[PDB]
Design an enzyme around this catalytic site. Sequence first.
Site, PDB file in Angstrom:
ATOM      1  N   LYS A 182      12.003  15.428  -6.320  1.00 47.23           N
ATOM      2  CA  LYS A 182      11.675  16.847  -6.314  1.00 47.23           C
ATOM      3  C   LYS A 182      12.911  17.659  -5.945  1.00 47.23           C
ATOM      4  O   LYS A 182      13.590  17.366  -4.955  1.00 47.23           O
ATOM      5  CB  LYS A 182      10.527  17.128  -5.342  1.00 47.23           C
ATOM      6  CG  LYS A 182       9.995  18.548  -5.415  1.00 47.23           C
ATOM      7  CD  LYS A 182       8.554  18.633  -4.942  1.00 47.23           C
ATOM      8  CE  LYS A 182       8.014  20.046  -5.093  1.00 47.23           C
ATOM      9  NZ  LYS A 182       6.541  20.112  -4.869  1.00 47.23           N
ATOM     10  N   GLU A 242     -10.395  19.367  -2.496  1.00 50.35           N
ATOM     11  CA  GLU A 242     -11.213  20.303  -1.728  1.00 50.35           C
ATOM     12  C   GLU A 242     -12.624  19.764  -1.505  1.00 50.35           C
ATOM     13  O   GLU A 242     -13.221  19.975  -0.440  1.00 50.35           O
ATOM     14  CB  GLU A 242     -11.263  21.646  -2.458  1.00 50.35           C
ATOM     15  CG  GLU A 242      -9.958  22.451  -2.416  1.00 50.35           C
ATOM     16  CD  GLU A 242      -8.849  21.923  -3.323  1.00 50.35           C
ATOM     17  OE1 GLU A 242      -9.080  20.987  -4.119  1.00 50.35           O
ATOM     18  OE2 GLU A 242      -7.723  22.458  -3.224  1.00 50.35           O
ATOM     19  N   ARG A 255     -13.605  24.919  -5.739  1.00 50.25           N
ATOM     20  CA  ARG A 255     -13.776  23.504  -6.063  1.00 50.25           C
ATOM     21  C   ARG A 255     -14.835  22.829  -5.205  1.00 50.25           C
ATOM     22  O   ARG A 255     -15.377  21.794  -5.609  1.00 50.25           O
ATOM     23  CB  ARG A 255     -12.452  22.756  -5.890  1.00 50.25           C
ATOM     24  CG  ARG A 255     -11.474  22.944  -7.047  1.00 50.25           C
ATOM     25  CD  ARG A 255     -11.882  22.098  -8.242  1.00 50.25           C
ATOM     26  NE  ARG A 255     -10.993  22.322  -9.380  1.00 50.25           N
ATOM     27  CZ  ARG A 255      -9.862  21.656  -9.590  1.00 50.25           C
ATOM     28  NH1 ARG A 255      -9.482  20.707  -8.746  1.00 50.25           N
ATOM     29  NH2 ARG A 255      -9.116  21.934 -10.653  1.00 50.25           N
TER      30      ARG A 255
HETATM   31  C1  LIG Z   1       1.551  28.880  -6.266  1.00 50.55           C
HETATM   32  O1  LIG Z   1       0.671  28.092  -5.451  1.00 50.55           O
HETATM   33  P1  LIG Z   1       0.955  26.591  -5.072  1.00 50.55           P
HETATM   34  O2  LIG Z   1       0.520  26.222  -3.684  1.00 50.55           O
HETATM   35  O3  LIG Z   1       2.495  26.318  -5.188  1.00 50.55           O
HETATM   36  C2  LIG Z   1       0.115  25.597  -6.374  1.00 50.55           C
HETATM   37  C3  LIG Z   1       0.898  25.680  -7.688  1.00 50.55           C
HETATM   38  O4  LIG Z   1      -1.154  26.225  -6.535  1.00 50.55           O
HETATM   39  C4  LIG Z   1      -0.054  24.104  -6.092  1.00 50.55           C
HETATM   40  S1  LIG Z   1       1.176  22.980  -6.544  1.00 50.55           S
HETATM   41  C5  LIG Z   1       0.515  21.788  -5.466  1.00 50.55           C
HETATM   42  C6  LIG Z   1       1.180  20.442  -5.381  1.00 50.55           C
HETATM   43  C7  LIG Z   1       1.085  19.647  -6.662  1.00 50.55           C
HETATM   44  O5  LIG Z   1       1.743  18.373  -6.458  1.00 50.55           O
HETATM   45  P2  LIG Z   1       2.232  17.466  -7.696  1.00 50.55           P
HETATM   46  O6  LIG Z   1       2.677  16.145  -7.185  1.00 50.55           O
HETATM   47  O7  LIG Z   1       1.110  17.439  -8.729  1.00 50.55           O
HETATM   48  O8  LIG Z   1       3.454  18.257  -8.340  1.00 50.55           O
HETATM   49  P3  LIG Z   1       5.000  18.262  -7.944  1.00 50.55           P
HETATM   50  O9  LIG Z   1       5.274  17.226  -6.904  1.00 50.55           O
HETATM   51  O10 LIG Z   1       5.301  19.681  -7.446  1.00 50.55           O
HETATM   52  O11 LIG Z   1       5.782  18.022  -9.245  1.00 50.55           O
HETATM   53  C8  LIG Z   1      -0.579  22.221  -4.797  1.00 50.55           C
HETATM   54  C9  LIG Z   1      -1.336  21.482  -3.748  1.00 50.55           C
HETATM   55  N1  LIG Z   1      -0.907  23.527  -5.170  1.00 50.55           N
HETATM   56  C10 LIG Z   1      -2.099  24.165  -4.591  1.00 50.55           C
HETATM   57  C11 LIG Z   1      -3.407  23.707  -5.182  1.00 50.55           C
HETATM   58  C12 LIG Z   1      -4.426  23.240  -4.383  1.00 50.55           C
HETATM   59  N2  LIG Z   1      -5.624  22.854  -4.838  1.00 50.55           N
HETATM   60  C13 LIG Z   1      -5.807  22.937  -6.163  1.00 50.55           C
HETATM   61  C14 LIG Z   1      -7.136  22.511  -6.699  1.00 50.55           C
HETATM   62  N3  LIG Z   1      -4.900  23.368  -7.044  1.00 50.55           N
HETATM   63  C15 LIG Z   1      -3.699  23.758  -6.578  1.00 50.55           C
HETATM   64  N4  LIG Z   1      -2.811  24.203  -7.477  1.00 50.55           N
END
Ligand SMILES: COP(=O)(O)[C@](C)(O)c1sc(CCOP(=O)(O)OP(=O)(O)O)c(C)[n+]1Cc1cnc(C)nc1N
Lengths: 595, 576
Positions: free
Chosen positions: B239, B323, B351
Amino acid sequence: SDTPLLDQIHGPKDLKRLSREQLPALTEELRGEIVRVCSRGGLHLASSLGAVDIITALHYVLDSPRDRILFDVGHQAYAHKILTGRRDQMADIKKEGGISGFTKVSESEHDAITVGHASTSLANALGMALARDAQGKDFHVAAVIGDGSLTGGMALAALNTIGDMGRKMLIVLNDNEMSISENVGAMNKFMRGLQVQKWFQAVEAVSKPSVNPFAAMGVRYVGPVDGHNVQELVWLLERLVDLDGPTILHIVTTKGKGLSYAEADPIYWHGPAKFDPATGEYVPSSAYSWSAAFGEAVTEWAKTDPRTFVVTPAMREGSGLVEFSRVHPHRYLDVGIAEEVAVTTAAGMALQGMRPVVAIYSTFLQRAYDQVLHDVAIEHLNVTFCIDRAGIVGADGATHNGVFDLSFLRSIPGVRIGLPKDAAELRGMLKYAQTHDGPFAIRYPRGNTAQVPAGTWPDLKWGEWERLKGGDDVVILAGGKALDYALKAAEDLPGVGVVNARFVKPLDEEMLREVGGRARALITVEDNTVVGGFGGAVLEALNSMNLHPTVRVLGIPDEFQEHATAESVHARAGIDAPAIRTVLAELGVDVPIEV
Amino acid sequence: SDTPLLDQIHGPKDLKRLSREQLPALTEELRGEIVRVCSRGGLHLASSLGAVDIITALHYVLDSPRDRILFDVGHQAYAHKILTGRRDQMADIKKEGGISGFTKVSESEHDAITVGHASTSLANALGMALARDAQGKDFHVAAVIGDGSLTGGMALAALNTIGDMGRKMLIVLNDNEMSISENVGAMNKFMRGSVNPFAAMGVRYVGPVDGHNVQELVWLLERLVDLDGPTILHIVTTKGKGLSYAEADPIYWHGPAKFDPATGEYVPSSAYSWSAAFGEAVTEWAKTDPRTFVVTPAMREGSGLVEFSRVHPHRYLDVGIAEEVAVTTAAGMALQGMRPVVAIYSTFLQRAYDQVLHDVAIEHLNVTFCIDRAGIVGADGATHNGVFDLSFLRSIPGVRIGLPKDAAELRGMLKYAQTHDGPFAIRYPRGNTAQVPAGTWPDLKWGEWERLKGGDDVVILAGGKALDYALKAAEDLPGVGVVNARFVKPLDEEMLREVGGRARALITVEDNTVVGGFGGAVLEALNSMNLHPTVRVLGIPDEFQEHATAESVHARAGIDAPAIRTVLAELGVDVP
Ligand SMILES: COP(=O)(O)[C@](C)(O)c1sc(CCOP(=O)(O)OP(=O)(O)O)c(C)[n+]1Cc1cnc(C)nc1N
Ligand SMILES: COP(=O)(O)[C@](C)(O)c1sc(CCOP(=O)(O)OP(=O)(O)O)c(C)[n+]1Cc1cnc(C)nc1N
Ligand SMILES: [Mg+2]
Ligand SMILES: [Mg+2]
Ligand code: NA
Ligand code: NA
């Protein structure tokens, strides 16, 4: 007496006074008892018969209520209730005022969780184990989860956390290759090829004085073992429950074990009508359900529309899709007990030009709320939701009453909502939804409606109501089951208008403006909570139009409704025909008196 | 120009004109471009940097938009947008009128799904593959899912169906051992250490392989995408790959403020957020309450729980991006006598709707929900705007709902919730509030509002962010009352009856959809009392709100202070 052993068992302490060699005889008494309890019809026979032996072994080894035994769904736990002081109450199970058809925390200290929806046992068990460890306590936590419930995302994700935390707990996988239909999914296919291990006689017990399907979960895996060898299950449980870390005990059971008819057809006998235990003959359902009307309509529709594709989450039988699955095998998908997957899979189909239909019960659609909102509604995708068991379902109680969909769907942008009064209107709404842009929801109750001829495909304008009874003084607005109550209530009351409010989203703004401005009082009726549902929609629309007529909002109160008949719930909630006539009298309508 | 290769690439067709030996140089241009785009702050830098090589390889091998490439969450897809004709638009990404920060179907034919919530890629990919096969078509379906997104139940269950159906599709597992925090779960632990982790899923498994060897990824993709059945390609990425500061601290650089690419120095956000107020309050509370236990679904940083996890390590749980598991685990804790707190964003609480209703509310369990990012969040757009919780929570029996006006009221609501029976929800926006002294624990009566400005002509009912707008709107208007409607469930029935019967007009304001929310609750309560005052319900319209500032959304939705004053003038108030 036919049950000398069970006659002396009023709780798990009495059970432990039996020797291990008497346990097979006890399971036979339990099976005969469960068969008699279920012979009146409407109960979960085959699942509880299959779970008799593991439940007997669990209570013989563990010390409930100090130890916590959690049942996923709880429909397989009749033997559990019989062994925990509720044997006499089984006669009135699921009846109003009787015990619940599932385990319920308020009902018994031996019921660790209140269940009905599937796949909740593992996260609940994790929470109890973490609470136990945080408090420095030392009791056993055991969860019984079926192979069908294991297909749920919240069970798979909870297992991922369970392996991460590494706490003491036992998971019994009750694998009978059955959900309601045959189970589906890759895990079910993989476990078919796993050979049964023999531990107590003792080949496997000698070997450890062959693959773990959950190896990536970091959980100890034992089995598969014979789920009907009660002494071997006792032997295994004694040697597993005190080990460090989480363990999955994989048992293999026969759904309906002990009744030949149920073993031969575990689908029907999952919930049989009144039957003769000696013959297996049962009272056939000669009625014509809303489920059958939907199944006939969508099977007919898919013959001329190759873009139609039906998705169900493990409810092929209940949603009325048996014939569809046979006529259109290449346009049918069962995603298991994973409502979240059903809706988002349909979203992907719609993105590639298909016209998917998600068949789903109202209570189970709750599991896919975010998938409807985020995966379907944001891009306004062509998913049609045909929602069965809408409103009060009755005997299944609070975990199953689908009285929230008019509230949680209504606040999602772009989700249209219709309530068909009959099968012709259901076909009209299905036709509209499959030929217009965006998502549409069509909700109808458990119950019956008249069959209509094949080729019945009326054109309707989505969003327009239909007046069915004249009258401008007091006007009742209602759809679906609530409309049946309203028409019955006004049957002998000229001047009481009745409007088929067959669309909750959008409302018929034009008709509501006219009726709301001319009537002195309105009545809204809905088989749904009064909180944020159809009545709330009418009040919001009337306020936007600056109209202030008297409005009586009738619906389910903001309280969970215990198991009873839908008629009893509706009578006490105040939406049936006598309750509407009482409200009409309160509003000044000349309602004939009974004296 | 620093980017000679990228200057000639306006789409995947142009990309395929490069030789395989030029692809490493192209990924360097892409990384430098992403660094410059994100240097203004507020963007997903580290995730998009890590995904540069697999995205380049995928577009080099596959033929988008004929083939469908699906991104889970979509925050890692900046290189995807740069390679699909949107390089110039990256300057205004997440700005009002610009392109979205995630992939969006209406934005480009190359964006296969609209994402923001995690773990939806696998079920979407299955639906597209089933649709392709039903139509007799023959294009590739590929999904890119991170190791964090794989912890979601809907991804694990979708994979179970994917293995059952056995259709042609490629799943790229982008494994960097990171979510926002370090990733959690047993699968993450297992993959840290020749076995197929998905053997029971019946899916072909290839890897793990180097996720930054762009030529090797091309070679692998060419030999996988045409195979029968589903395949998981497990790649390992770093990352923040390409920026030393981001590789060293992938947590902060997941979403960095304005920074200097040459030095790594960034603007420290010295503000006091609502998240920090909650974290301070719950860390303080748990010192004297051993029954408090905090659960987050992968948002330790966002919810303000970094210090809590350090001070109370034995009362903290991260369930990953699940969630549903967070809420039902808390239910089990409550059943065993604990006082669990679920920290969760409003948009992500969607969720767990059934888990709140079925697993918490039916038995009226002692779960407290501290709901961050409530209302419009702004730049993250429609997938993240938490404008529904006042509607979907309100129709659940027994779920109390509070909106604190400041940090002292937040502590009062948390104190009440942790010491009274049943579930309680406390929702507060993204943004800042004043710090309060340690030991601030006021006693409040749940369900009673507080009048903050006198006036009986027109009375405004509002809580939280909407209350700030209401107080500003009535600032110079005597006779315009303002009531802190800090409880949506229950309402203050006694005060609503008095105010509704005495005022000529009411205004309700909420940072929530107008459909079935606080305004709807007021109209329902007024109707039950047979009171018919004039009411103006102000809130977010029944339409998804695209990315913009929250203030811009609120101005156009009609809930900010100038919009309220316009409504007051319409109601006959003498507004200057
Ligand atoms: C702009 O807001 P954010 O916090 O950066 C964002 C994009 O919303 C994301 S990104 C994220 C981490 C995803 O981890 P991955 O390993 O899939 O991705 P990566 O390591 O960044 O390449 C989480 C927990 N959430 C939060 C998240 C939590 N729960 C759900 C269901 N969807 C989410 N998307
Ligand atoms: C009285 O209603 P019902 O249909 O019999 C009931 C109890 O509601 C059940 S039971 C059931 C099958 C469970 O299969 P298992 O393998 O876990 O259990 P078993 O083989 O019967 O021992 C399903 C799909 N549903 C339906 C169901 C679907 N989706 C969710 C989330 N929960 C459910 N519980
Ligand atoms: Mg089963
Ligand atoms: Mg990651
Ligand atoms: Na449609
Ligand atoms: Na509580």
